[PDB]
Amino acid sequence: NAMSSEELEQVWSNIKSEARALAECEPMLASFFHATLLKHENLGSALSYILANKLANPIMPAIAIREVVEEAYRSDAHMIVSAARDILAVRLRDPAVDKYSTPLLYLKGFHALQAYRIGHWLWAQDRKALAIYLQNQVSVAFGVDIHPAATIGCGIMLDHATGIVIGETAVVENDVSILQSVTLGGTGKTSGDRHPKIREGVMIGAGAKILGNIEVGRGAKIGAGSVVLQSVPAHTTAAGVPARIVGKPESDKPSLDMDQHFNGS
Amino acid sequence: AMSSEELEQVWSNIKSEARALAECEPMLASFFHATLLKHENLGSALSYILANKLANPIMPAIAIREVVEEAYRSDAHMIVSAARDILAVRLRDPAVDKYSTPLLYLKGFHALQAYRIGHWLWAQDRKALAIYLQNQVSVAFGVDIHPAATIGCGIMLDHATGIVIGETAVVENDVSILQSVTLGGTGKTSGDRHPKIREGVMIGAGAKILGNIEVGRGAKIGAGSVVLQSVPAHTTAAGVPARIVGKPESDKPSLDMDQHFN
Amino acid sequence: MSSEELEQVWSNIKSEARALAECEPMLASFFHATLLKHENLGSALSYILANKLANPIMPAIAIREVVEEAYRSDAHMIVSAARDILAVRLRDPAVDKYSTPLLYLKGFHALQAYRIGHWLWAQDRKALAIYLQNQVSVAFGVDIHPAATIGCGIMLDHATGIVIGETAVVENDVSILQSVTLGGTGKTSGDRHPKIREGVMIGAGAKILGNIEVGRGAKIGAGSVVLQSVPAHTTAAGVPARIVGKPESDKPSLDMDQHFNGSIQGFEYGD
Amino acid sequence: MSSEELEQVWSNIKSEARALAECEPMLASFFHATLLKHENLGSALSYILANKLANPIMPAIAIREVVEEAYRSDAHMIVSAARDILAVRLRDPAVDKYSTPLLYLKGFHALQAYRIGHWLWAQDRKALAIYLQNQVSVAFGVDIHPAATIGCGIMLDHATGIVIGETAVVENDVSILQSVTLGGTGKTSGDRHPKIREGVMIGAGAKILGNIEVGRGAKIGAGSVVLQSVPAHTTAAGVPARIVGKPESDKPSLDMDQHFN
Amino acid sequence: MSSEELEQVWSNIKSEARALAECEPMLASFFHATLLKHENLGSALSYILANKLANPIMPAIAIREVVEEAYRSDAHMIVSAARDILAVRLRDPAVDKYSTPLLYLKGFHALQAYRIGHWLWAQDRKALAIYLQNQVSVAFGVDIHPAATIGCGIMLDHATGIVIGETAVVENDVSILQSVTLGGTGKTSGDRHPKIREGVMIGAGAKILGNIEVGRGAKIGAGSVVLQSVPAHTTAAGVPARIVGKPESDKPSLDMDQHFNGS
Amino acid sequence: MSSEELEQVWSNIKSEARALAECEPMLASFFHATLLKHENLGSALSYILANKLANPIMPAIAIREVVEEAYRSDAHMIVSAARDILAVRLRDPAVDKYSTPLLYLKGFHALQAYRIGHWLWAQDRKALAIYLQNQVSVAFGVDIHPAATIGCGIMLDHATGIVIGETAVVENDVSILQSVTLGGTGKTSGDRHPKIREGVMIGAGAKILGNIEVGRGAKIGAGSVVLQSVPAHTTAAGVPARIVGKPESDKPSLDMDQHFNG
């Protein structure tokens, strides 16, 4: 999923192109599009602006949050490549999204995703107190609770996103697609590896509950509302409460196709 | 379809409750007064409340009221819908004992009314503003309703956290939907791919309904169920995935709220 | 909870605050205003809630007065709260500090907010409780009716999506995950919500409906839809839930073991 | 002022608006929600004022219903605003768009806010009028009592410091600058505040005290302390003020000639 | 001011609040949260000051706790606020309710805010005092240094533009109007602000500069610049000022008579 | 002011701010967010300014950007500000920390605010300039017109009520007290505002009007009304002002001697 700096700037230029048309057609939002997209020369400027505003609270206002976010980005440019891949993901996968700018401007799953990246960097930086603040602030604002120590790729779509929980020791690989109220949850009362490992290509239906240190193999599909307690073989479909292998997706990387069907028998 | 007298009675009941509310809880008095007592009809009170609820530094309450009020002038039936939606809430949910309760406090009711503003903006080809509000309601209330959706009235969204309703979803009149319900899509392409729910069907908490499917008239969709194929009229569908495990006891489950399935 | 126990918890919380303030300057004043500057937990908790629950309609400075009057009326609310902090610490592997629930965890926040509304409800100040209830719902995605009867030593992990209804009872030392409904059925008043007894743990997304009992030390699996009373010390799972085993210990709330079998046959088999 | 010359000012303001938006993309939404969206001066002005007067205690959305109610009742307040706008455009060289006083000028905003208080005062709503008055003093540093009687074609340039007392009267086409007091004397109720006739111009920091008159076309010098009446068409200056000349114009207010000797 | 003399004022203020609440529903909840719902003047006043000084840097809720710490340590701060309220009601003919200064009057709020700076400052919490000194100044256009020594039963009518510097003294029962300055001279520290004795009245726009004294019962005319001491029971006016007569009553502050002669 | 001297003022501030945050735990994060986290005056100012000037119409974070853009384009604005800091520190016996002007003093904020407005004005962003001018008038009670030409080493002590009009000029090293007007005359465009040359001290309440000059090192006594040009190194006082004497120092703006004896 690596991205040539020229690719990133191609993505940024597509968005700034949308922004101009948006400002014109909608005067009530023209000043908004201008301040967040049109005044900026690249995706990281915009992003730090968007998140600062979303995450602001009397405890820590937008202006103080943009400083943290931008320091993170100077330290780890790849975080911006991640965001662009995420934006690319939802446009291609979500038949409801038809502009590159919408994930960036509006979609809270995308925002919670990019907010976790900051929590994550802060975590690795041993700035855990701050990372925790942000974790819960994101939980309250978007209804999405992702622990900072989680390890998540890019090209990730969190559609609708409300109610998503991802725990401390989880791993989510690239090109993964996840729907509302999905839990990548723990088990037990002790510290230790106890959260799921979601491999490349996985698609997780809405309301699915995947618990423990178990694996979902690549190109696997978890049905909406399943409760997964054992590891799922690559390129299999799992489903039910608790889930069992039910069949096999009709494409190699279900995350890219968003087909929700399954047999459950 | 609600006559002026009916609209009025609804309003008359609310003012009545408010006068009492202001008297019993002084800290809220000025609130009641400004929101309800002050206005002469549901239309004026709603636009005020919706504005305040959608308010954002990007677009302030005072500015949102105008748009809301513009819609109510183009489509006055949005106000009637609202009235039916209050009534359904009071009739169906035993925890609510006032007409003012949904109008004032129940976000599911608010999300619903917010959607109708989006739905109108959509019709007007103001899709940008529609999209802005949709996601504003999502962040504010945890309810994600696409403005292209076609949603009737006499609709109860009880509790409402986590409700998702997609672009091509159709919900008809007199449908009750609980928290964590999805009327969801399938595939990566445009087109009919969201469920069409008919009159009177009741849907339990956490139900996931996926694809261009039908839930027929007066069907009951069991709580925590996942439905992938069309459910026939006046059956109870339940399970993961859902199977037809019976028939509702009443002709319109939505009005009864009986959560049981065989 | 004894006096000495309560002050120890508060004393730990302050000590955590000092250290937190030295290691995170962005947040030092917030730690000072919220915790360090207070003589005990009641003062801290009201400050917190007031700030959490503030709104244009009612600003934090006013709410604090209400919470204060409540704690002044029913001090065991503060004892409750202390019990809930311990619970989170002991049961959440992801929680490593006493100050974390109190400061950050909306599950815990929504619970102590419930406690204010529940006290109002019993003071016949129902308009205010109904107001607080839906404010807690919009801000935290947690919907608890003030007339519910909820104990302490309770954990609401993650918490987004929780619904607890009017006639529900939740006894002491219970653990509940995100998207758990303790909801009602039918269109009429009267007992219609579940009664959750000591020692229960309910997994993510469980929907428990009607006026049924879930017995002492039982477990409800994630994604389970409970339509019937669950006997004490049994495990119930599936949609609709049935009994599929017994928990590994006597009070599953404390251990948070999420495992269940899809079949009681399977639980006897070993898998 | 006629219907068609009121329309005129509104149409001009909107035009300035379409242009301001294009030239300042950061305020385009501001100009749009504030002017371009409204079909008349009254709408815009209620909008501006509501936003201007807003406080947690009473939000802009609420303040706006009050102000709208005052205008349904006495539409002349809207004609007075128009007049106040034309006064500033025409008499202040720093202002060159009608929209400017309407959007930005705090003196203009304190004047119009006084009219709502003044209206409320005659609607047996004195509690509310006193609330808005002191709210205006805090927000704009302009303290105007709502029982004061103030004409239109008034310019309050800069305006910080302006104090106008309860029993005071300002007639039409007057021009006041910053730091000017129209103040009372004594501990007792009753007439005790100045009466300022048509055409007068009062320089910055001038203090007019007691129930005295400043006559038609008289000019008060900046820094002046006026303790006795000033005959029409004279120039008064000094501490305490003395008569020292005659304005060169019949209506000093219109010309803003600050000179005295 | 006795225990009951104080209970009384507070009752007068509460009973006014009941009627206010009744005749303007829009402000009913506000009258209730600030006055009706409180038990005494200190409670009311801390709530009010809290909401008046609020800022994202330090919100009302935190501000209230400091204010209360102060009243708890120095309760006469509250007595002062009573004497000050009585003063505005007694001397300002446009003020007919005790509740008015307390609720609305920026110069009265500014005055009490100083009291808290002045306690902070004597408590060596000077950074705070200073932070408040300038917060009072930005919100209310009133700038007084926490180090000033300002007594009791004081009225700051209108208040915009008032400036009272670090070494100023103002005694009990003084009345001051808008755009007045009790100001300094020079670039060095040391005593350099005016001493204003009991019963003095200072008209609008008066600038008083340097370590000079305005004697007991004196009157300072509006617009006056005062560069030298002013004897007690004397009227001073002009730029610069000269004594131009003697005030009509013993304490002009009580009577607010603004008249003076030219020469 | 050199490069190496800027940095000692900054570090003197940063060093003060570390003492402050240890001494006042309620302000600790304030001090931290505003000074300590920054590695130069320009960053701290754009921060402080954005928050002092914040408004729903244009929020802090949006303002910071405009301000940073002004600094990039004309870095001397920052040296102006530092020279302004020093000015206060040395002239106002009430101030004993380099950080007091930067943090708290609105007359200094207004000055630096004017600077940005002045930049925009030159950038032909008059629209935004006018917005800021009046936002500063409301916020701080100081009205400075954007086209004004104002130097540095300038003190606006206290500063409530100051007015400085479109065609005014103030040269470096001027001290101006509260409620001072540099005002215009007439209803037509063109030079109608005072030019204050270097060194001038202007006492409180003074009003100076028309296109007139107050020469270098002259003193304008408080309450003065000045309608004719005032020679350099003279004291003018009275309503109206005449020459009353000569200041006792060569730059009165440094000495703050308010006495206009005569």
Those residues of chain C whose CB sits closer than 8 Å to some CB in chain F are 21, 25-30, 32-33, 36-37
Chain C residues bordering chain B (beta-carbon distance below 8 Å): 56-58, 62, 125, 127-128, 130-131, 133-134, 137-138, 141, 143, 145, 160-161, 163, 165-166, 179, 181, 183-190, 192, 205, 207, 209-210, 223-225, 227, 239-240
Q: For chain F, which chains pass the contact test of at least 3 CB pairs under 8 Å?
A: A, B, C, D, E
Residue A152: HSE in the Cβ half-sphere, 13 Å Cα cutoff: 34
Distance from CA of D259 to the nearest CA of B (A): 46
Q: Which residues in chain A have Cβ-Cβ distances shorter than 8 Å to E56? A: 58, 61
DSSP per-residue letters across C164-205? E-TT-EE-SS-EE-TT-EEE--SSSSSS-S-EE-TT-EE-TT
| Spatial distance between the Cα atoms of C103 and A133, rounded to a whole number of angstroms | 9
Q: Which residue of D has its CA nearest to F62?
A: D26
* F26 interaction partners in chain C (CB closer than 8 Å): 29, 32-33
One-letter amino acid for residue D110 of the chain: A
Integer angstrom CA distances of residue D22 from A23, A27, B211, D9, E128: 11, 11, 45, 20, 45
Q: Give how far the C-alpha of residue D133 lies from the chain's centroid of Cα atoms, to the nearest Å.
A: 13
Which of D188, D208, D225 is the best mutation test for E, with the most CBs of E within 10 A?
Answer: D225
Task: Compute and round to an integer the Cα radius of gyration of chain F.
Answer: 18
Cβ–Cβ < 8 Å for B145, B111: yes
* Helices H / strands E in chain C, number of each: 9, 15
Neighbouring residues of D216: CB distance < 8 A, sequence distance ≥ 6: D197, D198, D199, D200, D232, D233
Rg (CA), chain B: 18
B256, D103, F34 from B250: Cα distances, Å: 7, 61, 65
Residues of C with a Cβ under 8 Å from any D Cβ are 56, 59
Nearest residue on chain C to E38, alpha-carbon basis: C65
**How buried is E188 (Cβ within 10 angstroms: 0-12 exposed, 13-18 middle, 19+ buried)?**
exposed
What gap in Å lies between CA F183 and CA A264, rounded to an integer? 84
Are C222 and C178 within 8 A, CB to CB? Answer: no
Q: Name the DSSP class of D36.
A: I
Considering only CB atoms, D186 lies closest to which of E100, E177, E256, namely E256
C-alpha D111/C-alpha D53 separation (Å) is 12
Chains touching chain A, criterion 3+ CB pairs below 8 Å? B, C, D, E, F
How far is C119 from C146, CA to CA, in rounded Å? 8
d(CA F221, CA F214): 12
Say whether A31 and D36 touch across the interface (CB within 8 A). no
Tokens standing for B232?
Answer: 């026939």
Q: d(Cα D29, Cα B259) in Å, to the nearest integer? A: 49
Q: Which of A28, A32, A63 to mutate to test the interface with F (most CBs of F within 10 A)?
A: A63
Distance CA B81, CA E1 (A): 63
Dihedral (Cα; B168, B171, B176, B182), 10-degree rounding: -10
Chain F residues near residue B60 by CB distance under 8 angstroms: 56
D209: nearest CB among E100, E106, E222? E222
Cβ <8 Å between D33 and A28 = yes
Q: Breaks in chain A, named by the residue before each, with C–N above 2.5 Å?
A: none
Architecture in CATH for domain C143-271: 3 Solenoid (2.160)
Q: Which helix (H) or strand (E) holds A81?
A: helix A78-93
Q: Could you give the CA distance from residue E51 to residue E46 in angstroms, rounded to a whole number?
A: 9
With CB atoms and an 8 Å threshold, state whether B61 touches D59.
Answer: yes
Query: By CA distance, what is E60's nearest residue in A?
Result: A58
Strand partners, F155: F175
**CATH architecture of residue range(s) B1-143:** Orthogonal Bundle (1.10)
Cβ E204 vs Cβ D184: under 8 Å: no
Pairwise CB contact (< 8 Å): B131 & A106: yes
User: What is the token pair recorded at D68?
Assistant: 């709208």
Distance of CA C227 to the CA centre of its chain: 22
Distance CA A27, CA A22 (A): 9
Compute the nearest-CA separation of F53 from chain D (Å). 14
Question: Quick one: F214 exposed, middle or buried, by C-beta within 10 A (0-12, 13-18, 19+)?
Answer: buried
Other Cβ atoms less than 10 A from the Cβ of C254: the count is: 19
Considering only the beta carbons, identify the residue of E27, E36, E37 that sits closest to B30.
E27
Phi and psi angles of residue B243, each rounded to the nearest 5 degrees, phi first? -125, 155
Q: How far is CA F66 from CA A19, A49, A95, F72, in A?
A: 20, 14, 38, 10
Pairing status of strand A237-240 against strand A243-247: antiparallel
- Look-up of token digits 């009010």: E48
Is cis: bond before D240, omega within 30 of 0? yes
| Side chain identity at residue B83, one-letter code | A
**C201 to each of B41, C171, C221, F211, how far by Cα in Å?**
48, 11, 9, 83
Contact D32 A30 (CB under 8 A): yes
CA distances to C63, D215, F144 from D230, rounded to whole Å, are 56, 6, 32
Q: Which CATH number describes the domain made up of F143-262?
A: 2.160.10.10
Q: Report the alpha-carbon distance of residue D161 to residue E205 in Å, rounded.
A: 10
CA gap C22, F64 in Å, rounded: 28
**Best E178, E242, E249 residue to mutate vs chain D (most D CBs within 10 Å):** E178
Cβ-based neighbours of F20, under 8 Å, separated by 6 or more: E127, F27, F31, F99
**Any idea what DSSP says for residue D33?**
I
Contact C59 D59 (CB under 8 A): no
- Label residue F92 left, alpha or beta by phi (over 0 means left) and psi (-120 to 50 means alpha): beta
Q: How many CB atoms lie within 10 A of CB E248?
A: 11
Which structure tokens are listed for E116?
């808290």
For chain A, give every domain's residue range: 1-144, 145-265
Peptide linkage before E240 cis (omega within 30 of 0):
yes
CB atoms E28 and B27 under 8 Å: no
Helices (H), chain D: 3-23, 28-31, 41-53, 60-73, 76-91, 99-103, 106-121, 126-140
Report the topology of domain B144-262. UDP N-Acetylglucosamine Acyltransferase; domain 1 (2.160.10)
Inspect the interface and report whether the beta carbons of A62 and F60 lie closer than 8 Å: yes
Pick the CATH number of A145-265 from 3.20.20.70, 2.60.40.730, 1.20.1730.10, 2.160.10.10: 2.160.10.10
Contact C204 A165 (CB under 8 A): yes
Total residues found in chain C within this entry: 271
- What kind of architecture, by CATH, is found in domain E1-142? Orthogonal Bundle (1.10)
Instruction: Give D33's contacts in chain B (Cβ within 8 Å).
Output: 63, 66
Residue F175's DSSP bridge partners are F155, F201
Classify E143-263 by CATH class.
Answer: mainly beta
Name the nearest CA neighbour of C116 among C84, C141, C80, C156: C80
SS3 C55: coil
Asked if residue D230 lies in contact with residue D216, where contact means CB atoms within 8 angstroms, the answer is no
Size of interface A-E (CB pairs under 8 A): 3
Task: Tell me the C-alpha distance between F243 and F235, whole Å.
Answer: 6
Beta strands at C235-238 and C241-245: parallel, antiparallel or unpaired: antiparallel
Q: What is the DSSP string of D151-208?
A: -SS-EE-S-TT-EE-TT-EE-SS-EE-TT-EEE--SSS-SS-S-EE-TT-EE-TT-EE
CATH architecture of structural domain A1-144: Orthogonal Bundle (1.10)
Q: What HEC string does chain F produce?
A: CCHHHHHHHHHHHHHHHHHHHHHCCCCHHHHHHHHHCCCCHHHHHHHHHHHHCCECCECHHHHHHHHHHHHHHCCHHHHHHHHHHHHHHHHCCCCCCCHHHHHCCHHHHHHHHHHHHHHHHHCCCHHHHHHHHHHHHHHHCCEECCCCEECCCCEECCCCCCEECCCCEECCCCEECCCCEEECCCCCCCCCCCEECCCCEECCCCEEECCCEECCCCEECCCCEECCCECCCCEEECCCCEEEECCCCCCHHHHCCCCCCC
Q: How was this structure obtained? A: X-ray
Pairing mode, if any, of strands C241-245 and C219-220?
unpaired
Question: Regarding the domain with residue range D143-261, which homologous superfamily does it belong to in the CATH classification?
Answer: Hexapeptide repeat proteins (2.160.10.10)
CB-based contacts of D123, cutoff 8 Å, min separation 6: none
Q: F174, F154 in Cβ contact below 8 A?
A: yes
**Chain B CA closest to residue D50:** B62
Which residue from E127, E133, E181 is facing F27, i.e. has the nearest CB?
E127
> Sign of the CA dihedral B146, B149, B151, B156?
negative
Q: Which two tokens stand for residue B106?
A: 């129940």
Interface mutation vs chain A, best among F61, F72, F125, F131, most A CBs within 10 Å:
F61
Q: CB within 8 A of B205, min separation 6: which ones?
A: B159, B178, B179, B180, B181, B223, B224, C163, C181, C183, C207, C209
Q: Nearest CA to C87 among C119, C112, C114, C68?
A: C112
Selecting from F33, F59, F65 the residue whose C-beta is nearest the C-beta of A64 gives: F33
Exposed / middle / buried, residue D3 (Cβ in 10 Å: 0-12, 13-18, 19+): exposed
> How far does B54 lie from chain E, in Å, by closest CA?
22
**How many CB contacts within 8 angstroms connect chain C with chain E?**
20
Give the separation between CA E146 and CA E143, rounded to whole angstroms: 9
List, in sequence order, the alpha helices (H) in C74-186.
76-91, 99-104, 106-122, 126-140
Q: Do C93 and A165 touch (CB under 8 A)?
A: no
Q: Is E216 helix (H, G, I), strand (E, B) or coil?
A: coil
Q: 């009744």: which residue's tokens?
A: E22
Q: Residue-wise over A216-245: b if at least 16 C-beta within 10 A, else e?
A: bbbbbbbbbbbbbbeebeebbbbbbbbbee
Q: How many CB pairs under 8 A join C and D?
A: 3
In sequence order, the β-bridge partners of residue D155 are D175
| Residue C55: C-alpha distances to residues A219, C51, D39, E51 (Å) | 46, 9, 33, 14
